[PDB]
C-alpha cells in the first residue's frame, strides 16, 4: 500500500452573509471528501458512495448529534477568540485533525487550529503540549494544558483511533483509493518553451521535471499544479525555456506510482 491520510476539517464564521453556513465540517481520505455536515442542513451525510454503502443509518444519526454539539462548541470558541482579539465584523476559525499511514508502516498524527486562515494553535502529541502563535492563543494553551487528561486523550485518538478509522475507510473505498491509472504524457513546444503534459492519472501524487543534458535545472523549471480533470483523474505539466543559442538534450521525467518514464526531446 502507498501512503494514505485521513483529515477532518471544521470551519466557523462569526458573522456570515445571508444563507452562508456559520459552521461546516468535512472529512477526507487522501483527496476524496468522505463526510459532510453544516449548520444549515444540521445533518451528517456521506460524500462518497463507498462511505454511504458501508455505514448504516445509526452511524449517520449518531454523528449528526455529535456534530450538532461540536457546532455549538465551535461557536463558543470563536466567540471567545474574537472577544480576546477585540475584533469586529466577520472572522473565521478553523480546525484540522488527522493522521497518515505511510508506505513503510509508520504513522503521523496532527491537530491544529487557525484564526482568519493563519496558524493559531498546533498540538505536539510527543511533548504533549500546544504551540501558541500569539497571546490570545497563549491564554487558550494555558487552559487546554491545565487538564493533562485532555492531552493524553488527543495523543491516543491521533495515534490509535484515527489510524483505525483510516484503515477502515481504506478498505471500504478499496476500488477507488488503491487503484492506479497511469499518466498519458506528451511534450508540446510553444522565447520558446517546452511543455511536458500529463493527464488521465490516479492517484494525484506525481513528480514531473525537466533534465538538461542529464542534469536537473530546478531554478529554470516552471511547475504546474496537479489539477482535477473532473472524472476522478488528474492532470499536470512542467515547462522550461529553450536556449536559442546552443543545443541541449532535454528530457521530461515523470514518476508515478512506482513507475518512471522519460521523454527525450
Amino acid at each position: 500500500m502507498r501512503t494514505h491520510s485521513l483529515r477532518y476539517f471544521r470551519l466557523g464564521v462569526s458573522d456570515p452573509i445571508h444563507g452562508v453556513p456559520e459552521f461546516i465540517s468535512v472529512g477526507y481520505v487522501d483527496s476524496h471528501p468522505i463526510t459532510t455536515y453544516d449548520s444549515v442542513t444540521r445533518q451528517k451525510e456521506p460524500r462518497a458512495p463507498w462511505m454511504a454503502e458501508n455505514l448504516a443509518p445509526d452511524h449517520w444519526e449518531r454523528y449528526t448529534q455529535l456534530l450538532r454539539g461540536w457546532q455549538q462548541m465551535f461557536k463558543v470558541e470563536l466567540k471567545r477568540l474574537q472577544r480576546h482579539y477585540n475584533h469586529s465584523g466577520s472572522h473565521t476559525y478553523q480546525r484540522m485533525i488527522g493522521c497518515e499511514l505511510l508506505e513503510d508502516g509508520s504513522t503521523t498524527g496532527f491537530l491544529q487550529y487557525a484564526y482568519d486562515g493563519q496558524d493559531f494553535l498546533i498540538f505536539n502529541k510527543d511533548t504533549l503540549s500546544w504551540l501558541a502563535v500569539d497571546n490570545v492563543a497563549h491564554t487558550i494553551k494555558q487552559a487546554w494544558e491545565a487538564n493533562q487528561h485532555e492531552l493524553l486523550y488527543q495523543k491516543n485518538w491521533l495515534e490509535e483511533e484515527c489510524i483505525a478509522w483510516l484503515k477502515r475507510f481504506l478498505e471500504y473505498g478499496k476500488d477507488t483509493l488503491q487503484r492506479t491509472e497511469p499518466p498519458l504524457v506528451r511534450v508540446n513546444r510553444k522565447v520558446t518553451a517546452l511543455f511536458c503534459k500529463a493527464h488521465g492519472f490516479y492517484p494525484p501524487e506525481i513528480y514531473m521535471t525537466w533534465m538538461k543534458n542529464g542534469e536537473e535545472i530546478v531554478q529554470e523549471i516552471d511547475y504546474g499544479d496537479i489539477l482535477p480533470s473532473g472524472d476522478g483523474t488528474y492532470q499536470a505539466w512542467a515547462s522550461i525555456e529553450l536556449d536559442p543559442q546552443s543545443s541541449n538534450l532535454y528530457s521530461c521525467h515523470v514518476e508515478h506510482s512506482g513507475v518512471h518514464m522519460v521523454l527525450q526531446v
Epitope: 454539539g69 461540536w70 455549538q72 462548541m73 487538564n147 483511533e161
Partner: antibody, heavy 109, light 116 residues
Framework: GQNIDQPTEMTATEGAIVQINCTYQ??????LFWYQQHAGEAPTFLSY??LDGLEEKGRFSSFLSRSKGYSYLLLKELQMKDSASYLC??????????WGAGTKLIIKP | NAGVTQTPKFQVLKTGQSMTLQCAQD?????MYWYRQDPGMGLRLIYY???????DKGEVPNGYNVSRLNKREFSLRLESAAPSQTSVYFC??????????????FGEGSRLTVLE
C-alpha cells in the same frame, strides 16, 4: 461498544489493599473511567485512563493496558467509608459510554 | 452550585399511569442524559441531549420520551408506565459530548416502582 466485565463483589479487611479489575471488549477506545457509588447515592467520578500505565490520586490508583483491554482500580489503606460500588466504563469509537455492572466492595472492620 | 437536581426521589405508579421526571443542572453544561440502573447490569442510556436544541435515543428508548426544555433542563416522560420500568433513574450532565476526557456529573436518582 460491546462488553465490559468486572467481578460482582469483593470483600477485604480494613487497613488492607484491594485491586478491582475491569476488562473490556469494545469497538474502539477513547478512555476508561472509574466511578464510586455509595448505596442509595449518585455515582461520582473517580479516575480516567487513556494511555498505558499507572496513575495515582491519594489512596487510589488506576492502571490501564490498552493492548490487554484491562484496567484496575487499586485502593490502599482501606477504610469503612470505602464501602461502595465501583463502576467501570469505557468510551468506544463513537464516544458512547459502555458501563460495567459494578463491583460491590465490602470492608471488614 | 447545586450541580444536578432531579425530582422526585421516590414514586409509586399504577400500570398505565403517566409520570414526568425533572432534571436541571446549574453547571452551564451542554450535554444531558437519562439512565436507568437495574440489578445485575450496567447503566443503560435511555435518551440523551448532546447540546441544547437536539435530542436522540439511547440504548433503551421504548416507553419513554424526553424534552430538552432549555440549556438547564432535561425532562423524562413515561407516558404509560409498565412494571418493567420499575427502576432507579439517573439524570446526568457533561460539559460536552465526544470531546476529550470529560466525566459525567450525576443527579441523586429517582426510584420508580410500577404496580398492576
Amino acid at each position: 461498544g460491546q462488553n465490559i466485565d468486572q467481578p460482582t463483589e469483593m470483600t477485604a479487611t480494613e487497613g488492607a489493599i484491594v485491586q478491582i479489575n475491569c476488562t473490556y471488549q469494545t469497538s474502539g477506545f477513547n478512555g476508561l473511567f472509574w466511578y464510586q457509588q455509595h448505596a442509595g447515592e449518585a455515582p461520582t467520578f473517580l479516575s480516567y485512563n487513556v494511555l498505558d500505565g499507572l496513575e495515582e490520586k491519594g489512596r487510589f490508583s488506576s492502571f490501564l493496558s490498552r493492548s490487554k483491554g484491562y484496567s484496575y482500580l487499586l485502593l490502599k489503606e482501606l477504610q469503612m467509608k470505602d464501602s461502595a460500588s465501583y463502576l467501570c466504563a469505557v468510551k468506544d469509537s463513537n464516544y458512547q459510554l459502555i458501563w460495567g455492572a459494578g463491583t460491590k466492595l465490602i470492608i471488614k472492620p | 452550585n447545586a450541580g444536578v437536581t432531579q425530582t422526585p426521589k421516590f414514586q409509586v405508579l399504577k400500570t398505565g399511569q403517566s409520570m414526568t421526571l425533572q432534571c436541571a443542572q446549574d453547571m452551564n453544561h451542554n450535554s444531558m442524559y437519562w439512565y436507568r440502573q437495574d440489578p445485575g447490569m450496567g447503566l443503560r442510556l435511555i435518551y440523551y441531549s448532546a447540546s441544547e436544541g437536539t435530542t436522540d435515543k439511547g440504548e433503551v428508548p421504548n416507553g419513554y420520551n424526553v424534552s430538552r426544555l432549555n440549556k438547564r433542563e432535561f425532562s423524562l416522560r413515561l407516558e404509560s408506565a409498565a412494571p418493567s420500568q420499575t427502576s432507579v433513574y439517573f439524570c446526568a450532565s457533561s460539559v460536552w459530548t465526544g470531546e476529550g476526557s470529560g466525566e459525567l456529573f450525576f443527579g441523586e436518582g429517582s426510584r420508580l416502582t410500577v404496580l398492576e
